[PDB]
């Protein structure tokens, strides 16, 4: 009878038809991924076209039920998530215009290659070779031609594109009742619910801001330290009080400082805990890895894997001649068919990865009781955040001894601990300010707060002030460096890495404190602890059915982001770096 009752009914139709067609699309994509043939590409695209068609139509109709009239937030969440048209709310012709823009950018980035000046014949391509150069090279000038070469051939080229892009997207978000594009992306975190549990898209900037205020100390000290160690590699080039040259950070953007570990190892005599050889000696099998993971999850209280996950997946490269893509992923084919694809290899890395492709699978299984619209993590952070803490527990040497990859008598000492913690910090802490600053330049471009001309300037001003990096060659406004990043030029939001990174540690702290843990947070292993497991589940099952604030307060007792657990994980390294930089300058001079 009423609008809401009709709306229920509409949804029931939807969920049921959607679920089936999502099964078919995903099935089609799985045959492509695990069996790359022209025919299987054909079918994957056909099934995609059908899925897209269907979803667009159902969205048009879903708008016919006005959100105002629904009084059930668990229903309103589904509606509101289905209703937003996004690109379909723009008029038609600008849709094909934008699509040609975006497809053109992606093709540029993929085909982007910048010649070496010393031997132009041996020009080179980004993803195959240039990443390796940026990761291993030690020579300043060689590395430099790669940085500036990429940014010149590509950056320039994408300048025109990105701006029209900003215009079409800004307009589109405005069509959707979002004041600019960046607001549209901050929509994800918006969450209305029981009073006090709600979240306004604006509070995101304030909470990203204020958490980063807490993080900045640790970053500074990691920064001074790594600059100090770098000075010895690049004597002539590095100011002992200046920001660092951008190209010298191990990767083409300076997104992760992980590749600097070789150069910044604190105690190089004591090598890092690699159990690969141990695994190899016990003639372990990829299967064995996945079974060891499964036993982990069972030990914490979570269901053993489904016989479909133990009957269908690809867990090793096929090695019968059929091409596949190596990248590891955890699939949910909407019907009880969970699966993982992973070209596994016998290394500690894969052992730790597989624990968390399985942390996904186990999220998928947790929330599958929920209707098809609510079957996802409470927001963009929670999925990988949750499947990272698994690889955090599995890494601890306590665990590694537990399962017999580490001899029973093991020496775990300050020197190796710091070595480890520090590699962690290169990867985890590096990318907090990089990420936050990037998404703030994007946010502020979209709010029009950066006029066109001074894009690069404003950009680099922020990179000097927030990230403390150098911009080796001066870039004027003809240059376009942010588009050199995949996520930037392939239209992906990026604050997920900030939020996700801050979540994981709040989790691992809540569980550990609940697994009656004694000592450093960084040695915690939740294994054999069902109390922490049931507590994790109580949030795992909610999917998007409850506002992510509530999904969080269930686990960690607090309704928002909090860096305290992060700082608390890294406290051992913080003290050591502070003390290690008392005779050196801490901070960057923005010049």
């Amino acid at each position: 009878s009423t609008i809401e009752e009709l709306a229920k009914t509409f949804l029931d139709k939807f969920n049921q038809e959607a679920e089936d067609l999502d099964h078919q699309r995903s099935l089609a994509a799985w045959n492509y991924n695990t069996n790359i043939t022209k025919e299987n590409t054909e079918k994957m695209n056909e099934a995609e076209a059908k899925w897209s068609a269907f979803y667009e139509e159902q969205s048009k109709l879903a708008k016919d039920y006005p959100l105002q009239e629904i009084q059930n937030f668990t229903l309103k969440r589904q509606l509101q998530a289905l209703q937003q048209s996004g690109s379909s709310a723009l008029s038609a012709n600008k849709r094909e215009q934008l699509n040609t823009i975006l497809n053109t950018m992606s093709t540029i980035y993929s085909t982007g290659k910048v010649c070496n000046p010393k031997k132009p014949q041996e020009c080179l391509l980004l993803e195959p070779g240039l990443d390796e150069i940026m990761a291993n090279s030690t020579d300043y000038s060689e590395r430099l031609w790669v940085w500036e070469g990429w940014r010149s051939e590509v950056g320039k080229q994408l300048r025109p594109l990105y701006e029209e892009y900003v215009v079409l997207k800004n307009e589109m978000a405005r069509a959707n009742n979002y004041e600019d594009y960046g607001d549209y992306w901050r929509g994800d975190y918006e969450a209305e619910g029981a009073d006090g549990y709600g979240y306004n898209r604006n509070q995101l900037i304030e909470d990203v801001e204020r958490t980063f205020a807490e993080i900045k100390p640790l970053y500074e000290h990691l920064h001074a330290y790594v600059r100090a160690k770098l000075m010895n590699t690049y004597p002539s080039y590095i100011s002992p009080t200046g920001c660092l040259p951008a190209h010298l950070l191990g990767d083409m953007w300076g997104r992760f400082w992980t590749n600097l570990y070789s150069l910044t190892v604190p105690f190089p005599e004591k090598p890092n805990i690699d159990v690969t050889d141990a695994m190899i000696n016990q003639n372990w099998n990829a299967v064995r890895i996945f079974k060891e993971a499964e036993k982990f999850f069972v030990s914490v209280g979570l269901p053993n894997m489904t016989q479909g996950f133990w009957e269908n997946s690809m867990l090793t490269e096929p090695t019968d001649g059929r091409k596949v893509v190596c990248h590891p992923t955890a699939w949910d084919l909407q019907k009880g068919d969970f699966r993982i694809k992973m070209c596994t290899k016998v290394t500690m890395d894969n052992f730790l990865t597989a624990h968390h492709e399985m942390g996904h699978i186990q999220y998928d299984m947790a929330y599958a009781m929920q209707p098809y619209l609510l079957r996802n993590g409470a927001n963009e952070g929670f999925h990988e955040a949750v499947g990272e803490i698994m690889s955090l527990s599995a890494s601890t040497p306590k665990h590694l001894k537990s399962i017999g990859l580490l001899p029973s008598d093991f020496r775990e000492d300050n020197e190796t601990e710091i070595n480890f913690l520090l590699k962690q910090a290169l990867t985890i802490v590096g990318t907090l300010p990089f990420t936050y600053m990037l998404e703030k330049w994007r946010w502020m471009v979209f709010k029009g707060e950066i006029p066109k001309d001074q894009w690069m300037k404003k950009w680099w001003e922020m990179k000097r002030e927030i990230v403390g990096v150098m911009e080796p060659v001066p870039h004027d406004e003809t240059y376009c460096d942010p588009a050199a990043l995949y996520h930037v030029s392939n239209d992906f939001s990026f604050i997920r890495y900030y939020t996700r990174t801050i979540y994981q540690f709040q989790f691992q702290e809540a569980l550990c404190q609940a697994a009656k843990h004694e000592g450093p947070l960084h040695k915690c292993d939740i294994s054999n602890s069902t109390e922490a497991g049931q507590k994790l589940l109580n949030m795992l099952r909610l999917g998007k059915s409850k506002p992510w604030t509530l999904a969080l307060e269930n686990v960690v007792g607090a309704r928002n982001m909090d860096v305290r657990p992060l700082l608390n994980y890294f406290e051992p390294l913080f003290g050591w770096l502070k003390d290690q930089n008392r005779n050196s300058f801490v901070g960057w001079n923005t010049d």
Binding site: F10, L27, G308, N312, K335, G336, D337
Partner: protein
């Protein structure tokens, strides 16, 4: 006395879709019900109203054997007091029920690598079926106030949809075949014993 043809119902090659369930009446019959329980290849076998062992040497007056194919997940609704999508709009059993609910997985037969969208189920209906009612009307279901003359649009949906079984799906989403046995000591001449 000649044997019940339970065998020709249970081992039948093709099963009706739930919404048009297939009903067979059994009469003039001797049968061995302790054979069916002896088999135990049946995932589900919960005879209500009367213990399964007792009835083999008790004679009965009519027997109705209803068979259909339903989603594994849903077998729990084929029992008295259950309200689900199936029991609501497809095959309700009454409260005062005296009979059986035999069911088994049929994945190897009723599932296809690629899809077997042959079976169907009715998702909308103005009101709940009364016990044992059958309904096969394909009339467009109008939930709106605005009437739909044949055109399916907003607030006016088609009432049936396809199960679409696959060999890879999970148990709950796997095709279970089902046979419900009804007994009727209410008529004068009994005609089904053991």
């Amino acid at each position: 006395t000649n044997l019940c043809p339970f065998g020709e119902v249970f081992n039948a090659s093709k099963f009706a879709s739930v919404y048009a369930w297939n009903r067979k009446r059994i009469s003039n019959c001797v049968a061995d019900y302790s054979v069916l329980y002896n088999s135990t290849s049946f995932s589900t076998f919960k005879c209500y109203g009367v213990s399964p062992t007792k009835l083999n040497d008790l004679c009965f007056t009519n027997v109705y054997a209803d068979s259909f194919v339903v989603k594994g997940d849903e077998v729990r609704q084929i029992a008295p007091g259950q309200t689900g999508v199936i029991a609501d709009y497809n095959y309700k059993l009454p409260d005062d029920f005296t009979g059986c609910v035999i069911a088994w997985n049929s994945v190897k037969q009723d599932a296809l690598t690629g899809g077997n969208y042959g079976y169907l189920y009715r998702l909308f209906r103005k009101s709940k079926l009364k016990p044992f009612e059958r309904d096969i009307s394909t009339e467009i279901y109008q939930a709106g106030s605005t009437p739909c003359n044949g055109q399916v649009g907003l607030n006016c949906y088609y009432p049936l949809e396809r199960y679409g079984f696959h060999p890879t799906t999970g148990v709950n989403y796997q095709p279970f075949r089902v046979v419900v046995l009804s007994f009727e000591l209410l008529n004068g001449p009994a005609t089904v014993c053991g």
